[PDB]
Coordinates of N, CA and C in Angstrom, one line a residue:
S1 N -77.6 -15.7 70.9 CA -79.1 -15.9 71.0 C -79.7 -15.5 69.6
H2 N -80.4 -14.4 69.6 CA -81.0 -14.0 68.3 C -80.1 -12.9 67.7
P3 N -80.0 -12.9 66.3 CA -79.1 -11.9 65.7 C -79.3 -10.5 66.1
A4 N -80.5 -10.1 66.4 CA -80.8 -8.7 66.8 C -80.1 -8.4 68.2
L5 N -80.0 -9.4 69.1 CA -79.3 -9.2 70.3 C -77.8 -9.2 70.1
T6 N -77.3 -10.0 69.2 CA -75.9 -10.0 68.9 C -75.6 -8.6 68.3
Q7 N -76.4 -8.1 67.4 CA -76.1 -6.8 66.9 C -76.2 -5.7 68.0
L8 N -77.3 -5.8 68.8 CA -77.4 -4.8 69.9 C -76.1 -4.8 70.8
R9 N -75.6 -6.0 71.1 CA -74.5 -6.0 72.0 C -73.2 -5.5 71.5
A10 N -73.0 -5.6 70.2 CA -71.8 -5.1 69.5 C -71.8 -3.6 69.1
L11 N -72.9 -2.9 69.2 CA -73.0 -1.5 68.8 C -71.9 -0.8 69.6
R12 N -71.3 0.2 69.0 CA -70.3 1.0 69.7 C -70.9 2.2 70.4
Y13 N -71.2 2.0 71.6 CA -71.9 3.0 72.4 C -71.0 4.1 73.0
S14 N -71.5 5.4 73.0 CA -70.8 6.4 73.7 C -71.8 7.4 74.2
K15 N -71.3 8.4 75.0 CA -72.2 9.4 75.5 C -72.5 10.5 74.5
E16 N -72.0 10.4 73.3 CA -72.4 11.4 72.3 C -73.8 11.2 71.9
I17 N -74.7 12.3 72.0 CA -76.1 12.3 71.6 C -75.9 13.1 70.3
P18 N -76.2 12.5 69.1 CA -76.0 13.4 67.9 C -77.1 14.4 67.8
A19 N -76.8 15.4 66.9 CA -77.8 16.5 66.7 C -78.9 16.1 65.7
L20 N -79.8 15.3 66.3 CA -80.9 14.8 65.5 C -82.1 15.6 65.6
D21 N -83.1 15.3 64.8 CA -84.4 16.0 64.8 C -84.9 15.9 66.2
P22 N -85.5 17.0 66.8 CA -86.1 16.9 68.1 C -86.9 15.7 68.5
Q23 N -87.8 15.3 67.5 CA -88.6 14.1 67.8 C -87.8 12.9 68.0
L24 N -86.8 12.7 67.2 CA -85.9 11.5 67.3 C -85.2 11.6 68.6
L25 N -84.7 12.8 69.0 CA -84.1 12.9 70.3 C -85.0 12.5 71.4
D26 N -86.3 13.0 71.3 CA -87.2 12.7 72.3 C -87.4 11.2 72.5
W27 N -87.4 10.4 71.3 CA -87.5 9.0 71.4 C -86.2 8.4 72.1
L28 N -85.1 8.8 71.7 CA -83.8 8.3 72.2 C -83.6 8.6 73.6
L29 N -84.0 9.8 74.1 CA -83.7 10.2 75.4 C -84.8 9.9 76.5
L30 N -85.9 9.3 76.0 CA -87.0 8.9 77.0 C -86.5 8.3 78.2
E31 N -86.9 8.8 79.4 CA -86.4 8.1 80.7 C -87.4 7.1 81.1
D32 N -87.5 6.0 80.3 CA -88.4 4.9 80.5 C -88.0 3.9 79.4
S33 N -88.6 2.7 79.5 CA -88.5 1.8 78.4 C -89.5 2.4 77.3
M34 N -89.5 1.7 76.2 CA -90.4 2.1 75.1 C -91.8 1.5 75.1
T35 N -92.1 0.7 76.1 CA -93.4 0.1 76.1 C -94.6 1.0 76.0
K36 N -94.8 1.9 76.8 CA -96.0 2.8 76.8 C -95.9 3.7 75.6
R37 N -94.7 4.3 75.2 CA -94.7 5.2 74.1 C -95.0 4.4 72.8
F38 N -94.6 3.1 72.7 CA -94.9 2.3 71.5 C -96.5 2.1 71.5
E39 N -97.1 1.8 72.7 CA -98.5 1.6 72.8 C -99.2 2.9 72.3
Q40 N -98.6 4.1 72.5 CA -99.2 5.3 72.1 C -99.2 5.5 70.6
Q41 N -98.6 4.6 69.9 CA -98.6 4.7 68.4 C -99.9 3.9 67.9
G42 N -100.7 3.5 68.9 CA -101.9 2.8 68.6 C -101.7 1.4 68.4
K43 N -100.9 0.8 69.3 CA -100.5 -0.6 69.1 C -100.5 -1.3 70.4
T44 N -100.7 -2.6 70.2 CA -100.6 -3.6 71.3 C -99.2 -4.0 71.4
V45 N -98.5 -3.9 72.6 CA -97.1 -4.2 72.8 C -97.0 -5.6 73.4
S46 N -96.1 -6.4 72.9 CA -95.9 -7.7 73.4 C -94.4 -8.1 73.4
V47 N -94.1 -9.1 74.2 CA -92.7 -9.6 74.4 C -92.5 -11.0 73.9
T48 N -91.4 -11.1 73.1 CA -90.9 -12.4 72.6 C -89.7 -12.7 73.5
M49 N -89.7 -13.7 74.3 CA -88.6 -14.0 75.2 C -87.5 -14.7 74.6
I50 N -86.3 -14.1 74.6 CA -85.1 -14.7 73.9 C -84.3 -15.4 74.9
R51 N -84.1 -14.8 76.1 CA -83.4 -15.5 77.2 C -83.7 -14.8 78.5
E52 N -83.9 -15.6 79.6 CA -84.0 -14.9 80.9 C -83.5 -15.9 81.9
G53 N -82.7 -15.4 82.9 CA -82.2 -16.3 84.0 C -81.1 -15.6 84.7
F54 N -80.7 -16.2 85.8 CA -79.5 -15.7 86.5 C -78.3 -16.2 85.8
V55 N -77.3 -15.2 85.7 CA -76.1 -15.5 85.0 C -74.9 -15.0 85.9
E56 N -73.7 -15.4 85.5 CA -72.5 -15.0 86.1 C -71.8 -13.9 85.3
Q57 N -70.8 -13.3 85.9 CA -70.1 -12.2 85.2 C -69.7 -12.5 83.8
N58 N -69.3 -13.8 83.5 CA -68.8 -14.2 82.2 C -69.9 -14.0 81.1
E59 N -71.1 -13.8 81.4 CA -72.1 -13.7 80.4 C -72.5 -12.3 80.2
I60 N -71.9 -11.3 80.9 CA -72.3 -9.9 80.8 C -71.1 -9.0 80.5
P61 N -70.2 -9.4 79.6 CA -69.0 -8.6 79.3 C -69.3 -7.1 79.0
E62 N -70.3 -6.8 78.3 CA -70.6 -5.4 78.0 C -71.1 -4.6 79.2
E63 N -71.9 -5.2 80.0 CA -72.4 -4.5 81.2 C -71.6 -4.5 82.4
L64 N -70.7 -5.5 82.6 CA -69.9 -5.6 83.8 C -69.1 -4.4 84.2
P65 N -68.5 -3.7 83.2 CA -67.8 -2.5 83.6 C -68.7 -1.4 84.1
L66 N -69.9 -1.5 83.8 CA -70.9 -0.4 84.2 C -71.7 -0.8 85.4
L67 N -71.5 -1.9 86.0 CA -72.3 -2.4 87.2 C -71.4 -2.8 88.3
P68 N -72.0 -3.0 89.5 CA -71.2 -3.5 90.6 C -70.7 -4.9 90.2
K69 N -69.6 -5.3 90.6 CA -69.0 -6.7 90.4 C -69.5 -7.5 91.5
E70 N -70.3 -8.5 91.2 CA -70.9 -9.4 92.2 C -71.1 -10.8 91.6
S71 N -71.6 -11.8 92.3 CA -71.7 -13.1 91.8 C -72.7 -13.4 90.8
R72 N -73.9 -12.8 90.9 CA -75.0 -13.1 90.0 C -75.8 -11.9 89.6
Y73 N -76.4 -12.0 88.4 CA -77.2 -11.0 87.7 C -78.3 -11.7 87.1
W74 N -79.5 -11.0 87.0 CA -80.6 -11.4 86.2 C -80.4 -10.8 84.8
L75 N -80.3 -11.7 83.8 CA -80.1 -11.3 82.4 C -81.4 -11.6 81.7
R76 N -82.0 -10.6 81.0 CA -83.2 -10.7 80.3 C -83.0 -10.1 78.9
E77 N -83.3 -11.0 77.8 CA -83.2 -10.5 76.4 C -84.5 -10.8 75.8
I78 N -85.1 -9.7 75.2 CA -86.4 -9.9 74.5 C -86.4 -9.2 73.2
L79 N -87.4 -9.5 72.4 CA -87.8 -8.7 71.2 C -89.2 -8.1 71.7
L80 N -89.4 -6.8 71.4 CA -90.6 -6.1 71.8 C -91.3 -5.8 70.4
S81 N -92.6 -6.2 70.4 CA -93.4 -6.1 69.1 C -94.6 -5.2 69.4
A82 N -95.0 -4.6 68.3 CA -96.1 -3.7 68.2 C -97.1 -4.3 67.2
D83 N -98.3 -4.7 67.7 CA -99.2 -5.4 66.8 C -98.5 -6.5 66.1
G84 N -97.6 -7.2 66.8 CA -96.9 -8.4 66.3 C -95.7 -8.2 65.4
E85 N -95.4 -6.9 65.2 CA -94.2 -6.6 64.3 C -93.1 -6.2 65.3
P86 N -91.9 -6.8 65.1 CA -90.8 -6.5 66.0 C -90.3 -5.1 65.8
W87 N -90.2 -4.4 66.9 CA -89.8 -3.0 66.9 C -88.5 -2.7 67.6
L88 N -88.2 -3.6 68.6 CA -87.0 -3.3 69.4 C -86.5 -4.6 70.0
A89 N -85.2 -4.6 70.2 CA -84.5 -5.7 71.0 C -84.0 -5.1 72.2
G90 N -84.3 -5.8 73.3 CA -83.9 -5.3 74.7 C -83.1 -6.3 75.5
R91 N -82.1 -5.7 76.1 CA -81.3 -6.6 77.0 C -81.1 -5.9 78.3
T92 N -81.6 -6.5 79.4 CA -81.5 -5.9 80.7 C -80.7 -6.8 81.6
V93 N -79.8 -6.1 82.4 CA -78.9 -6.8 83.3 C -79.1 -6.2 84.7
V94 N -79.5 -7.0 85.6 CA -79.8 -6.6 87.0 C -79.0 -7.3 88.0
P95 N -78.1 -6.5 88.7 CA -77.3 -7.2 89.7 C -78.3 -7.8 90.8
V96 N -77.9 -9.0 91.3 CA -78.8 -9.5 92.3 C -79.0 -8.5 93.5
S97 N -78.0 -7.8 93.9 CA -78.2 -6.8 94.9 C -79.2 -5.8 94.7
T98 N -79.7 -5.6 93.4 CA -80.8 -4.6 93.1 C -82.1 -5.3 93.3
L99 N -82.2 -6.6 93.4 CA -83.5 -7.3 93.6 C -83.9 -7.3 95.0
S100 N -84.6 -6.3 95.4 CA -85.1 -6.1 96.8 C -86.3 -5.2 96.7
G101 N -87.2 -5.3 97.6 CA -88.4 -4.5 97.6 C -89.2 -4.6 96.3
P102 N -89.8 -3.6 95.8 CA -90.5 -3.7 94.6 C -89.6 -4.2 93.4
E103 N -88.3 -3.9 93.5 CA -87.4 -4.3 92.4 C -87.2 -5.8 92.3
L104 N -87.7 -6.6 93.3 CA -87.7 -8.0 93.1 C -88.5 -8.4 91.9
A105 N -89.5 -7.5 91.5 CA -90.3 -7.9 90.3 C -89.5 -7.9 89.0
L106 N -88.3 -7.3 89.0 CA -87.5 -7.3 87.7 C -87.2 -8.7 87.3
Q107 N -87.2 -9.7 88.2 CA -86.9 -11.1 87.8 C -88.1 -11.9 87.6
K108 N -89.3 -11.3 87.8 CA -90.6 -11.9 87.6 C -91.5 -11.3 86.6
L109 N -90.9 -10.6 85.6 CA -91.8 -9.9 84.6 C -92.4 -10.9 83.6
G110 N -91.7 -12.0 83.3 CA -92.2 -12.9 82.3 C -92.5 -12.1 81.0
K111 N -93.6 -12.3 80.4 CA -93.9 -11.6 79.2 C -94.5 -10.3 79.4
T112 N -94.5 -9.8 80.6 CA -94.9 -8.4 80.8 C -93.8 -7.5 80.4
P113 N -94.1 -6.5 79.5 CA -93.0 -5.6 79.1 C -92.6 -4.6 80.1
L114 N -91.3 -4.5 80.3 CA -90.8 -3.6 81.3 C -91.2 -2.1 81.1
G115 N -91.4 -1.4 82.2 CA -91.7 0.1 82.1 C -91.8 0.6 83.5
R116 N -91.7 1.9 83.6 CA -91.9 2.6 84.9 C -93.3 2.3 85.4
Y117 N -94.3 2.1 84.6 CA -95.7 1.8 84.9 C -95.8 0.6 85.9
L118 N -94.8 -0.3 85.9 CA -94.8 -1.4 86.8 C -94.3 -1.1 88.2
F119 N -93.6 0.0 88.3 CA -93.0 0.4 89.6 C -93.6 1.7 90.1
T120 N -94.8 1.6 90.6 CA -95.6 2.8 91.1 C -95.1 3.4 92.3
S121 N -94.2 2.7 93.0 CA -93.7 3.2 94.3 C -92.1 3.4 94.3
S122 N -91.6 3.4 93.1 CA -90.1 3.5 93.0 C -89.7 4.6 92.1
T123 N -88.7 5.4 92.6 CA -88.2 6.5 91.8 C -87.3 5.8 90.7
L124 N -87.3 6.5 89.5 CA -86.5 6.0 88.4 C -85.6 7.2 88.0
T125 N -84.2 7.0 88.1 CA -83.3 8.1 87.6 C -82.4 7.4 86.6
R126 N -81.6 8.1 85.9 CA -80.7 7.6 84.9 C -79.3 8.2 85.1
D127 N -78.3 7.3 85.4 CA -77.0 7.8 85.6 C -76.4 8.3 84.3
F128 N -76.7 7.7 83.2 CA -76.1 8.2 81.9 C -76.9 7.5 80.8
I129 N -76.8 8.0 79.6 CA -77.3 7.4 78.4 C -76.2 7.4 77.4
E130 N -76.1 6.3 76.7 CA -75.1 6.2 75.6 C -76.0 5.9 74.4
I131 N -75.5 6.3 73.2 CA -76.1 6.1 71.9 C -75.1 5.4 71.0
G132 N -75.6 4.5 70.2 CA -74.7 3.8 69.2 C -75.5 3.6 67.9
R133 N -74.9 3.2 66.8 CA -75.6 3.0 65.5 C -74.8 1.9 64.8
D134 N -75.6 1.1 64.1 CA -75.0 0.0 63.3 C -75.9 -0.3 62.1
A135 N -75.4 -0.4 60.9 CA -76.2 -0.7 59.7 C -77.5 0.1 59.6
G136 N -77.4 1.4 60.0 CA -78.5 2.3 59.9 C -79.4 2.3 61.1
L137 N -79.1 1.4 62.1 CA -80.0 1.3 63.2 C -79.5 1.9 64.5
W138 N -80.3 2.7 65.2 CA -80.0 3.3 66.4 C -80.2 2.3 67.6
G139 N -79.2 2.4 68.5 CA -79.4 1.7 69.8 C -79.0 2.7 70.9
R140 N -79.4 2.3 72.2 CA -79.0 3.2 73.3 C -78.7 2.2 74.5
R141 N -77.9 2.7 75.4 CA -77.5 1.9 76.6 C -77.6 2.9 77.8
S142 N -78.3 2.4 78.8 CA -78.6 3.3 80.0 C -78.3 2.6 81.3
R143 N -77.6 3.2 82.2 CA -77.6 2.7 83.6 C -78.7 3.4 84.3
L144 N -79.8 2.7 84.7 CA -81.0 3.2 85.4 C -80.9 2.9 86.9
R145 N -81.6 3.7 87.7 CA -81.7 3.4 89.1 C -83.1 3.4 89.5
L146 N -83.6 2.3 90.1 CA -84.9 2.1 90.6 C -84.8 2.2 92.1
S147 N -85.4 3.1 92.7 CA -85.2 3.3 94.2 C -83.7 3.4 94.6
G148 N -82.9 4.0 93.7 CA -81.5 4.1 93.9 C -80.6 2.9 93.5
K149 N -81.2 1.9 93.1 CA -80.4 0.6 92.8 C -80.2 0.5 91.3
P150 N -79.0 0.2 90.9 CA -78.7 0.1 89.4 C -79.1 -1.1 88.7
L151 N -79.3 -0.8 87.4 CA -79.6 -1.9 86.4 C -79.1 -1.3 85.1
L152 N -78.8 -2.2 84.2 CA -78.4 -1.8 82.8 C -79.4 -2.2 81.8
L153 N -79.8 -1.3 80.9 CA -80.8 -1.5 79.9 C -80.2 -1.1 78.6
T154 N -80.1 -2.0 77.6 CA -79.6 -1.7 76.3 C -80.8 -2.0 75.3
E155 N -81.0 -1.1 74.4 CA -82.1 -1.3 73.4 C -81.6 -1.0 72.0
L156 N -82.1 -1.8 71.1 CA -81.8 -1.6 69.7 C -83.1 -1.4 69.0
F157 N -83.2 -0.3 68.2 CA -84.5 0.0 67.5 C -84.5 -0.6 66.1
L158 N -85.4 -1.6 65.9 CA -85.4 -2.4 64.7 C -85.9 -1.6 63.5
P159 N -85.7 -2.1 62.3 CA -86.1 -1.3 61.1 C -87.6 -0.9 61.1
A160 N -88.5 -1.6 61.6 CA -89.9 -1.3 61.5 C -90.3 -0.3 62.5
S161 N -89.5 0.1 63.5 CA -89.9 0.9 64.6 C -90.1 2.4 64.1
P162 N -90.8 3.2 64.9 CA -91.2 4.6 64.5 C -90.1 5.6 64.5
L163 N -88.9 5.2 64.9 CA -87.8 6.2 64.8 C -87.4 6.4 63.4
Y164 N -87.6 5.5 62.5 CA -87.1 5.7 61.2 C -88.1 6.3 60.2

Protein backbone atom coordinates (compact mmCIF):
# COMPACT_ATOMS: atom_id res chain seq x y z
CA SER A 1 0.00 0.00 0.00
CA HIS A 2 1.77 3.09 1.17
CA PRO A 3 5.52 2.97 2.10
CA ALA A 4 4.79 4.03 5.66
CA LEU A 5 2.58 0.98 6.11
CA THR A 6 5.22 -1.29 4.55
CA GLN A 7 7.75 0.16 6.98
CA LEU A 8 5.32 -0.24 9.88
CA ARG A 9 4.69 -3.89 9.07
CA ALA A 10 8.36 -4.81 8.87
CA LEU A 11 9.54 -3.23 12.15
CA ARG A 12 10.99 -5.87 14.45
CA TYR A 13 8.65 -5.70 17.43
CA SER A 14 9.34 -7.12 20.90
CA LYS A 15 8.13 -6.70 24.46
CA GLU A 16 11.23 -4.73 25.36
CA ILE A 17 10.28 -1.17 26.37
CA PRO A 18 13.57 0.76 26.27
CA ALA A 19 14.72 3.04 29.07
CA LEU A 20 13.49 6.21 27.42
CA ASP A 21 12.72 9.65 28.81
CA PRO A 22 9.50 9.43 30.85
CA GLN A 23 7.57 11.66 28.45
CA LEU A 24 8.50 9.40 25.51
CA LEU A 25 7.47 6.36 27.55
CA ASP A 26 4.17 8.03 28.32
CA TRP A 27 3.59 8.49 24.59
CA LEU A 28 4.53 4.91 23.75
CA LEU A 29 2.64 3.27 26.57
CA LEU A 30 -0.62 5.17 26.22
CA GLU A 31 -3.56 2.77 26.55
CA ASP A 32 -5.51 4.30 23.72
CA SER A 33 -4.94 5.33 20.14
CA MET A 34 -3.10 8.62 19.55
CA THR A 35 -6.09 10.59 18.38
CA LYS A 36 -7.01 12.60 21.41
CA ARG A 37 -3.44 13.01 22.70
CA PHE A 38 -2.46 14.37 19.26
CA GLU A 39 -5.48 16.77 19.41
CA GLN A 40 -4.10 17.94 22.79
CA GLN A 41 -1.06 19.25 20.93
CA GLY A 42 -3.50 21.91 19.66
CA LYS A 43 -4.25 20.20 16.42
CA THR A 44 -7.11 18.99 14.32
CA VAL A 45 -6.72 15.24 13.71
CA SER A 46 -7.73 13.62 10.45
CA VAL A 47 -7.58 10.30 8.68
CA THR A 48 -6.17 9.51 5.18
CA MET A 49 -7.61 6.11 4.26
CA ILE A 50 -4.99 3.74 2.78
CA ARG A 51 -7.04 0.55 2.78
CA GLU A 52 -10.13 -0.83 4.58
CA GLY A 53 -12.11 -4.00 4.07
CA PHE A 54 -12.55 -7.60 5.01
CA VAL A 55 -9.59 -9.80 4.37
CA GLU A 56 -8.48 -13.40 4.76
CA GLN A 57 -5.61 -14.78 6.81
CA ASN A 58 -3.28 -14.44 3.86
CA GLU A 59 -3.29 -10.66 4.16
CA ILE A 60 -2.45 -10.49 7.91
CA PRO A 61 0.78 -12.43 8.29
CA GLU A 62 2.11 -10.22 11.05
CA GLU A 63 -1.10 -10.24 13.09
CA LEU A 64 -2.27 -13.79 12.60
CA PRO A 65 0.03 -15.36 15.19
CA LEU A 66 -1.37 -12.86 17.69
CA LEU A 67 -5.09 -13.29 16.97
CA PRO A 68 -7.63 -16.11 16.83
CA LYS A 69 -7.38 -18.02 13.53
CA GLU A 70 -10.68 -17.55 11.73
CA SER A 71 -12.01 -16.88 8.22
CA ARG A 72 -12.23 -13.09 8.06
CA TYR A 73 -10.83 -9.98 9.57
CA TRP A 74 -11.47 -6.30 9.13
CA LEU A 75 -8.14 -4.69 8.03
CA ARG A 76 -7.81 -0.92 8.26
CA GLU A 77 -4.68 1.04 7.28
CA ILE A 78 -4.53 4.79 7.67
CA LEU A 79 -2.25 7.76 7.87
CA LEU A 80 -3.22 10.03 10.86
CA SER A 81 -2.54 13.78 10.39
CA ALA A 82 -2.41 16.74 12.73
CA ASP A 83 -3.39 19.99 11.03
CA GLY A 84 -2.83 18.11 7.77
CA GLU A 85 0.71 16.95 8.54
CA PRO A 86 1.13 13.16 8.67
CA TRP A 87 2.13 12.05 12.17
CA LEU A 88 1.35 8.33 12.31
CA ALA A 89 0.60 5.28 10.24
CA GLY A 90 -1.90 2.86 11.73
CA ARG A 91 -2.87 -0.66 10.93
CA THR A 92 -5.77 -2.33 12.71
CA VAL A 93 -6.80 -5.95 12.35
CA VAL A 94 -10.12 -7.02 13.87
CA PRO A 95 -11.25 -10.66 13.80
CA VAL A 96 -14.87 -10.80 12.61
CA SER A 97 -15.70 -12.56 15.94
CA THR A 98 -14.85 -9.28 17.72
CA LEU A 99 -17.45 -7.37 15.65
CA SER A 100 -20.47 -7.55 17.96
CA GLY A 101 -22.21 -5.03 20.14
CA PRO A 102 -20.61 -1.63 20.21
CA GLU A 103 -17.51 -3.16 18.62
CA LEU A 104 -19.46 -3.53 15.36
CA ALA A 105 -18.44 0.12 14.92
CA LEU A 106 -14.84 -0.89 14.34
CA GLN A 107 -15.81 -1.73 10.73
CA LYS A 108 -17.80 1.50 10.28
CA LEU A 109 -15.33 4.20 11.39
CA GLY A 110 -14.67 5.56 7.94
CA LYS A 111 -12.65 8.75 8.34
CA THR A 112 -13.41 8.93 12.05
CA PRO A 113 -10.12 8.37 13.87
CA LEU A 114 -10.11 5.44 16.25
CA GLY A 115 -10.03 6.04 20.00
CA ARG A 116 -11.54 4.96 23.29
CA TYR A 117 -13.74 8.11 23.04
CA LEU A 118 -15.82 6.23 20.42
CA PHE A 119 -16.57 3.30 22.77
CA THR A 120 -18.25 4.90 25.81
CA SER A 121 -19.73 1.64 27.00
CA SER A 122 -16.78 -0.70 26.44
CA THR A 123 -13.89 -1.59 28.64
CA LEU A 124 -10.49 -1.34 26.99
CA THR A 125 -7.58 -3.45 28.26
CA ARG A 126 -4.24 -4.34 26.63
CA ASP A 127 -2.87 -7.86 26.61
CA PHE A 128 0.65 -6.70 25.76
CA ILE A 129 2.55 -3.94 24.02
CA GLU A 130 5.56 -4.40 21.79
CA ILE A 131 7.93 -1.66 20.65
CA GLY A 132 10.05 -1.60 17.47
CA ARG A 133 12.31 0.93 15.71
CA ASP A 134 13.42 1.41 12.11
CA ALA A 135 15.40 4.24 10.47
CA GLY A 136 15.11 6.31 13.63
CA LEU A 137 11.32 5.85 13.90
CA TRP A 138 9.49 4.27 16.79
CA GLY A 139 6.55 1.93 16.29
CA ARG A 140 4.40 -0.12 18.67
CA ARG A 141 2.14 -3.14 18.37
CA SER A 142 -0.66 -3.91 20.82
CA ARG A 143 -3.25 -6.60 21.26
CA LEU A 144 -6.22 -4.66 22.73
CA ARG A 145 -9.47 -5.92 24.13
CA LEU A 146 -12.72 -3.97 23.79
CA SER A 147 -15.32 -5.56 26.08
CA GLY A 148 -13.00 -8.53 26.29
CA LYS A 149 -12.70 -9.09 22.50
CA PRO A 150 -9.32 -8.89 20.75
CA LEU A 151 -7.99 -6.67 18.06
CA LEU A 152 -4.52 -5.86 16.87
CA LEU A 153 -3.30 -2.27 16.50
CA THR A 154 0.15 -1.40 15.09
CA GLU A 155 1.30 2.22 14.89
CA LEU A 156 4.36 3.87 13.42
CA PHE A 157 5.29 7.43 14.56
CA LEU A 158 6.28 9.45 11.52
CA PRO A 159 9.09 11.97 11.55
CA ALA A 160 6.91 15.05 12.14
CA SER A 161 5.18 13.55 15.18
CA PRO A 162 5.77 14.91 18.72
CA LEU A 163 7.72 11.98 19.94
CA TYR A 164 10.86 13.21 18.22
